[PDB]
Amino acid sequence: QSMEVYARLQNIWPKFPRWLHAAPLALAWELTRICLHCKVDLEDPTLRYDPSWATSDMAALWRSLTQLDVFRGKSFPERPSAEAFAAALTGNFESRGNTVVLSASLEFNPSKTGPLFLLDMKPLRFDEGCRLTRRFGPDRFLEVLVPSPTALNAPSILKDGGAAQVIRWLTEKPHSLVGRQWQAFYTKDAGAKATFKERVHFFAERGHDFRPAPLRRTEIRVSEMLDWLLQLEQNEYQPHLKLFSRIQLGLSKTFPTVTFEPNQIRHRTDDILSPAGKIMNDGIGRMSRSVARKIRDALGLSDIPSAIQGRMGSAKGMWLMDVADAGDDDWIETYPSQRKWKCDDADALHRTLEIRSVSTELKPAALNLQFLPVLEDRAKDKARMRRAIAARLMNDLKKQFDSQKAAVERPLQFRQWVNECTNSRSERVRHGQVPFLGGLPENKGEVLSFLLNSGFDRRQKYIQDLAFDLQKQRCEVLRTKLNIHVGRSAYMFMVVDFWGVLEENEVHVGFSSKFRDDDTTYMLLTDCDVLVARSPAHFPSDIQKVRAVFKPQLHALKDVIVFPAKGDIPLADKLSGGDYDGDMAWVCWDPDIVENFTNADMPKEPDLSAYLGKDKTTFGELVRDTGTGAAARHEAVYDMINKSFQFAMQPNYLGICTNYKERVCYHNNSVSDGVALLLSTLVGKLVDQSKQGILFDAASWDRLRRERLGGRMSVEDPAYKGDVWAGAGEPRHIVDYLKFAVAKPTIDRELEELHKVMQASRDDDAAAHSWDPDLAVYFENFKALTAESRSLRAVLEALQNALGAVEHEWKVLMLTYPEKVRQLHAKWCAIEPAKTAALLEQPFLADRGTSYWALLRASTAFKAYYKTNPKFVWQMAGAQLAFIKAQMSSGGSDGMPLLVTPLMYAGLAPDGRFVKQYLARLEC
């Protein structure tokens, strides 16, 4: 509708040749991927169809195929998972709760009658299912990441002609792909530098397989889908954009838990009201004890959660355990603030609890920098608070280094430390073992435990090396983000108190178990003040002090925080406009912080009405534009999609006014002047921009700053937006101080104290050397063999020349990193040898990686490139040096060699109880 665009927007999506029409979608999609990966044109027939395809494992279909030689080629692409692809033909797209996705990804192109957008079809991926995909079949949905067409900028034709035919292209008709008609329904914010994207959800309305009609695969429009989900005749009263936003409830990624009976769902008509006006339980309502037992059962938690975040048809938010239920019937209640459209809750998938997230066990959280200036403002003593905060930074940091340098002195304990600092557990479960990247584990802290399990020390330069990398990389996190750890703080779910036990400024926090703070332990909080705060805190009052009081009534509500239902304003609200619908709280009970805090009073949101303008046009006025009947209802849906998209794709000002605030407050060295309450208010209203259909745009933004602020022009980036310190004097600003003056120096200092220390080795005995005589014991033995040789001799010499060329390969390969590491591993694993040439290789062993040659390969590798390329041999052979180092450091009769298989090994962990008691005996 320009036209520039058209013709552009061609041919963005590839077509569908008659040889692929046979079905199914699975191979059709993955074959489309192969063809454009291999840059083969799909409009070359001379091709056919194979029934074996309907059965196999892509590599099977991918080895067809290829043959053909022009499919040689190449190989790849990334390829879908084992459980996924088989389900993509014969498992109907689903494993228990995890659906199979179709996901494409769009980035810009330049010219024309050229595309404009470049497709990237990711392979079939398992994700969790939502309600629509569960209802209509996961095969009928597509999600693409699309660049926003109002993100300036881009290549020039983009927005040279600002407009927006782009959006009209996405919404108006379908998009023909792999035989199907995909029609857009929802558009959301994305869940040197590249550009920002919009996630767009298409629903396949028809295609090559399809058949009518009300009252597989049937024909079925986006208009009927939403009519199912939303139930449209009973919801005309809604503003269409607000009804559009509600789509997000049917798309939310959730685990299905229980379907209730209509009686067992207790739809409350009123919210609990202020003693009085203000709802005191926004989004939160009780579930039964049994549903909570059930939710554990269903998902498999190691314990019943006291609270849950789900979805329940039209309902959304938090359910907590009713403590006053003792009994054995399942029930759940719902409240108005929960229920987001009028749902009759008829069919089963509107009656079923879909679980988003559970109450799980707290971890120490610390203090994000966003809260820093707020705290400084509400500090009693600002200097002492500065000194309070910085001190805690350096001590946790001292604490984690001294703990780690002491551990390193003793294998058992150095192993024990690594295990207490990360987790490959959820990765191990995944791949059935310790996933391995060439010759060594993927995760570094897994790499250490294996090389220590195999009997290595701080005699080995590589082991020293990795110990340093681990802690350094966790330092990096801290020097950028200022995630300043606070031993006495957690992130908790807010819950409200339905039983009237806590008073206006009283909260209840109990743990599900022993909370560790370094010195001391906790299992609840009583008779002590606590700071509560929802991220982000923008007002001085968005951080609130309250008294942590325990009530044994609520003993059973664990790992959450209970706010009162009493007084005028619910606490959740006081914390940056919160409510209880998933929102979590920064709960700090550190005395040194809390007691220097003094409460501020809730501001009044200033009159910003001339800039904030809700488009309240309803879904019923949109139908009335079509004249009556179901038809007028059918097109209204497409009116609304089309119009909601033009809104959805406007620039997210939320993030731009928040940036401006972070700059205007930093310069103005205030969070508590008048221009800060004006922005704080504004960024408040804009978090709801989506679901309120608010009109706030380039015009209003300029208009505002003209009339009420500075200061249109680029306000400066703050100093802490760099690495090293910019200006004149040791820093004044709290955040600059904390970054440049404290964190940087504290870290660099302690990084060095154990790079001192490496590095001291020379031959004092002590210290670290890549060289280890044990690790070349296969090499030397075979080198005098081979003296004395004949053609053995031929064996060794070509191995050594081979290895050379492989390390040469590493040199370049200095284009994805593990890929490179693998590419050149297989070239490493390719080095292959009357008489012992029958033995060493041992091809009754299925895979070259548990043979004796492999040792010799690696022990020889080591001597030649330990100089030199220590790394190169560890990333290829590391597990083969492990055999060696395990065999040789063993004497025999003082322990034999116990070989644990990958699964059994990934099933074992270091035994803290044993390490504590076994040192207790070594230090007699």
Side-chain angles (χ1 to χ4, degrees), residues 1-186 188-752 754-924:
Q1 233 275 243
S2 18
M3 65 317 188
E4 269 77 42
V5 297
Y6 284 61
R8 308 197 75 177
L9 307 160
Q10 278 231 349
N11 190 34
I12 293 284
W13 327 92
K15 290 93 221 159
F16 210 43
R18 250 219 154 59
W19 97 77
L20 284 167
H21 288 207
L25 211 177
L27 87 73
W29 170 278
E30 293 289 348
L31 288 204
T32 308
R33 277 177 79 253
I34 295 158
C35 277
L36 68 64
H37 188 281
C38 300
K39 274 284 172 286
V40 183
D41 179 25
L42 276 156
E43 294 90 71
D44 199 302
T46 14
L47 284 142
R48 65 231 242 273
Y49 185 79
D50 227 296
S52 70
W53 284 341
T55 48
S56 278
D57 142 291
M58 205 79 258
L61 290 46
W62 282 21
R63 312 166 193 197
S64 290
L65 179 70
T66 89
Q67 236 186 317
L68 261 71
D69 239 53
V70 73
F71 290 87
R72 193 68 224 122
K74 223 192 167 67
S75 58
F76 267 63
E78 197 210 81
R79 173 196 183 282
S81 310
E83 300 175 9
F85 182 90
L89 296 83
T90 179
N92 262 39
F93 283 64
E94 214 145 3
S95 188
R96 206 191 153 70
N98 48 49
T99 193
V100 183
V101 170
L102 310 184
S103 74
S105 146
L106 304 192
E107 281 221 4
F108 285 116
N109 204 76
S111 301
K112 148 55 227 166
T113 123
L116 182 58
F117 294 99
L118 287 174
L119 281 56
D120 147 62
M121 272 47 129
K122 293 285 235 284
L124 281 28
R125 122 190 216 170
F126 262 107
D127 280 295
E128 185 51 49
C130 62
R131 196 193 288 188
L132 257 11
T133 66
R134 279 203 297 288
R135 165 64 191 84
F136 293 92
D139 60 300
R140 297 198 79 153
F141 297 90
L142 172 80
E143 62 162 70
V144 310
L145 276 169
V146 70
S148 188
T150 76
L152 280 79
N153 185 21
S156 306
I157 224 292
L158 181 158
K159 177 62 165 64
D160 77 340
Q165 293 60 38
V166 164
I167 301 164
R168 195 185 267 82
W169 171 71
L170 293 172
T171 52
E172 191 76 34
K173 285 312 305 212
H175 302 249
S176 221
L177 190 68
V178 185
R180 262 162 211 216
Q181 297 298 266
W182 309 89
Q183 166 58 258
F185 65 112
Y186 194 65
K188 196 175 164 73
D189 47 291
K193 294 91 181 257
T195 330
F196 304 96
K197 324 200 159 281
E198 279 276 8
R199 194 196 317 290
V200 182
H201 299 274
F202 302 81
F203 172 91
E205 294 193 328
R206 199 201 45 123
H208 307 129
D209 268 339
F210 289 62
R211 45 92 166 242
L215 246 309
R216 310 293 188 89
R217 189 54 66 147
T218 51
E219 288 161 14
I220 235 193
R221 330 164 148 107
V222 171
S223 41
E224 284 176 287
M225 184 194 71
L226 298 186
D227 190 36
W228 180 87
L229 164 66
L230 300 174
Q231 311 185 330
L232 303 169
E233 300 279 317
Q234 292 73 10
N235 291 296
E236 305 212 306
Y237 62 93
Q238 302 219 44
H240 64 272
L241 313 178
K242 169 187 283 186
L243 180 67
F244 180 92
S245 91
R246 298 313 183 212
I247 284 171
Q248 181 45 32
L249 279 90
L251 279 180
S252 188
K253 259 124 174 83
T254 48
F255 299 84
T257 280
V258 50
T259 303
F260 289 69
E261 287 295 335
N263 71 102
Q264 301 182 327
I265 306 163
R266 306 174 176 170
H267 291 313
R268 297 288 289 158
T269 295
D270 319 355
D271 297 273
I272 284 147
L273 296 163
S274 171
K278 191 51 178 96
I279 306 105
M280 312 285 310
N281 72 321
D282 194 342
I284 189 141
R286 302 156 269 170
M287 66 204 168
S288 78
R289 202 140 171 71
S290 35
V291 173
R293 286 160 195 194
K294 219 77 64 140
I295 300 177
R296 152 159 59 60
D297 290 0
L299 288 41
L301 313 186
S302 262
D303 225 345
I304 318 169
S306 311
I308 197 63
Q309 193 212 341
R311 327 288 187 209
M312 187 57 157
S314 71
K316 191 258 301 160
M318 293 303 279
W319 283 274
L320 65 93
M321 252 179 11
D322 197 344
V323 306
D325 170 34
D328 42 297
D329 297 8
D330 309 327
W331 57 272
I332 190 154
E333 86 188 344
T334 76
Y335 286 88
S337 75
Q338 284 183 328
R339 307 194 297 283
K340 302 282 142 237
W341 69 78
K342 186 70 195 265
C343 200
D344 58 1
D345 263 40
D347 87 280
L349 283 132
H350 291 145
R351 265 166 25 250
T352 303
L353 198 54
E354 305 164 311
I355 302 325
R356 187 79 208 200
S357 61
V358 297
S359 163
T360 74
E361 201 202 323
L362 307 193
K363 176 186 153 183
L367 176 65
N368 102 83
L369 59 53
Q370 150 73 76
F371 303 131
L372 280 166
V374 185
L375 279 164
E376 168 200 57
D377 177 275
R378 311 277 61 229
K380 262 211 213 94
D381 183 338
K382 291 173 182 197
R384 273 192 86 115
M385 164 282 158
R386 224 163 172 128
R387 180 63 52 173
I389 287 305
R392 174 190 316 282
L393 163 45
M394 303 156 211
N395 287 334
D396 166 71
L397 194 56
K398 266 209 200 324
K399 142 226 148 294
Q400 70 186 75
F401 271 102
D402 313 304
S403 287
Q404 176 227 347
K405 41 207 178 136
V408 162
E409 304 293 351
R410 273 256 205 75
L412 275 106
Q413 284 153 345
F414 188 49
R415 188 187 69 175
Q416 195 55 236
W417 175 81
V418 172
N419 189 66
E420 284 150 353
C421 94
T422 336
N423 179 29
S424 303
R425 193 168 63 265
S426 323
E427 307 187 49
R428 279 181 179 197
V429 176
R430 192 191 168 168
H431 292 90
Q433 50 155 58
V434 174
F436 248 55
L437 167 62
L440 289 181
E442 304 257 8
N443 173 320
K444 287 187 312 314
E446 200 93 289
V447 175
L448 265 137
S449 285
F450 166 54
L451 302 165
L452 255 82
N453 277 322
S454 286
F456 277 113
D457 219 322
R458 90 195 270 176
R459 263 201 195 109
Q460 177 42 270
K461 176 60 146 65
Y462 197 80
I463 278 193
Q464 202 183 51
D465 288 331
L466 290 215
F468 187 17
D469 296 318
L470 286 165
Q471 191 74 311
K472 190 171 296 175
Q473 309 225 51
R474 357 175 29 191
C475 292
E476 298 293 294
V477 178
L478 173 68
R479 65 164 194 113
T480 59
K481 289 168 191 172
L482 301 180
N483 35 325
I484 302 168
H485 164 61
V486 179
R488 300 206 243 202
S489 81
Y491 266 97
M492 293 168 60
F493 281 116
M494 288 154 278
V495 180
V496 76
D497 148 50
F498 289 91
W499 312 271
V501 287
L502 299 150
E503 312 292 322
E504 175 157 352
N505 282 284
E506 277 193 345
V507 305
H508 162 125
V509 181
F511 307 125
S512 76
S513 99
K514 148 189 276 219
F515 188 81
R516 305 174 216 283
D517 151 29
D518 178 89
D519 62 59
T520 207
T521 268
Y522 297 112
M523 70 171 277
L524 68 282
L525 277 43
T526 303
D527 289 287
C528 95
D529 291 7
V530 294
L531 251 53
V532 290
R534 272 201 330 116
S535 289
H538 290 300
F539 296 121
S541 93
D542 291 351
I543 298 185
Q544 282 298 281
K545 198 157 135 195
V546 292
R547 181 76 157 172
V549 186
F550 193 80
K551 310 289 170 158
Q553 306 91 305
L554 317 173
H555 92 255
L557 306 166
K558 315 205 260 166
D559 300 329
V560 303
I561 182 158
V562 194
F563 292 167
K566 299 187 176 186
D568 300 0
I569 306 104
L571 219 179
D573 198 0
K574 275 176 129 197
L575 322 182
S576 194
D579 65 348
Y580 312 87
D581 66 342
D583 308 5
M584 293 200 59
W586 182 73
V587 200
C588 210
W589 63 89
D590 180 288
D592 272 26
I593 276 167
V594 168
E595 315 285 308
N596 293 286
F597 196 85
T598 139
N599 273 348
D601 298 309
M602 292 298 279
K604 189 164 75 90
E605 304 220 58
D607 184 30
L608 290 178
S609 40
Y611 318 69
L612 271 50
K614 288 161 220 274
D615 181 344
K616 270 219 178 293
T617 288
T618 67
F619 187 66
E621 286 165 288
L622 278 171
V623 159
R624 188 176 188 193
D625 298 348
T626 305
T628 210
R633 209 168 66 59
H634 169 206
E635 192 57 84
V637 162
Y638 285 89
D639 277 11
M640 174 201 54
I641 287 157
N642 193 56
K643 275 160 125 65
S644 289
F645 260 75
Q646 212 196 330
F647 167 85
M649 297 321 168
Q650 293 307 294
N652 169 55
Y653 285 100
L654 176 59
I656 160 175
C657 307
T658 290
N659 300 323
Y660 182 78
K661 198 172 92 47
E662 188 213 325
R663 294 183 171 74
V664 194
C665 300
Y666 165 89
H667 256 18
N668 278 350
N669 211 49
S670 174
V671 284
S672 73
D673 58 4
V675 313
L677 305 198
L678 216 153
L679 294 162
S680 276
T681 290
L682 161 62
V683 301
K685 307 300 301 204
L686 290 175
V687 293
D688 294 319
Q689 196 171 331
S690 349
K691 53 153 151 193
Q692 260 40 50
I694 307 159
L695 158 174
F696 189 81
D697 68 0
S700 34
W701 180 227
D702 296 326
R703 186 179 289 146
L704 209 166
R705 291 174 295 158
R706 235 223 321 287
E707 290 157 23
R708 318 254 165 269
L709 298 182
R712 298 179 69 167
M713 250 185 21
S714 186
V715 178
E716 297 68 17
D717 266 64
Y720 62 86
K721 294 277 194 173
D723 291 320
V724 290
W725 161 249
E730 331 257 23
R732 300 301 158 67
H733 192 280
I734 183 153
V735 184
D736 293 347
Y737 171 87
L738 287 152
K739 193 167 164 156
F740 299 112
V742 171
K744 230 274 201 298
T746 295
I747 290 163
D748 291 356
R749 181 156 69 266
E750 209 83 346
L751 299 185
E752 282 274 7
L754 52 142
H755 169 67
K756 176 174 74 71
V757 138
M758 251 206 184
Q759 205 77 321
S761 297
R762 196 186 45 75
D763 229 71
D764 53 333
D765 202 32
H769 284 86
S770 276
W771 177 247
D772 168 36
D774 303 4
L775 252 63
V777 84
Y778 283 84
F779 166 82
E780 293 295 340
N781 197 69
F782 193 84
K783 198 188 83 75
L785 191 133
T786 233
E788 215 71 1
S789 202
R790 276 90 189 271
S791 70
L792 299 167
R793 195 85 172 119
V795 194
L796 174 80
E797 291 171 18
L799 160 56
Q800 287 161 338
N801 303 344
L803 294 150
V806 175
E807 105 86 38
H808 221 234
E809 259 303 329
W810 187 80
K811 259 169 158 20
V812 265
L813 303 170
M814 342 201 112
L815 66 170
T816 338
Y817 174 81
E819 202 171 327
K820 290 203 281 282
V821 159
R822 289 179 186 177
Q823 284 177 21
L824 67 91
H825 185 75
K827 276 195 185 209
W828 164 279
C829 293
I831 298 154
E832 178 177 357
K835 171 161 190 182
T836 85
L839 299 164
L840 269 166
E841 197 174 307
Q842 302 187 321
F844 58 85
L845 294 168
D847 212 287
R848 282 188 286 234
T850 343
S851 105
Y852 294 165
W853 170 260
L855 288 312
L856 179 76
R857 152 151 97 209
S859 94
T860 293
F862 189 71
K863 211 272 188 297
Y865 295 135
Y866 86 97
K867 293 103 173 171
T868 295
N869 268 112
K871 224 179 293 163
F872 155 68
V873 331
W874 294 96
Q875 197 121 53
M876 301 307 102
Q880 276 91 15
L881 313 170
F883 254 111
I884 300 155
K885 192 51 166 176
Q887 299 168 265
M888 278 288 284
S889 62
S890 171
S893 73
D894 299 329
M896 299 300 298
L898 302 74
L899 216 74
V900 295
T901 71
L903 164 276
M904 304 295 296
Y905 173 96
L908 286 160
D911 205 338
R913 274 175 203 75
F914 171 100
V915 167
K916 181 181 239 264
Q917 293 190 357
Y918 180 105
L919 100 98
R921 112 114 180 87
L922 265 177
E923 285 148 52
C924 302

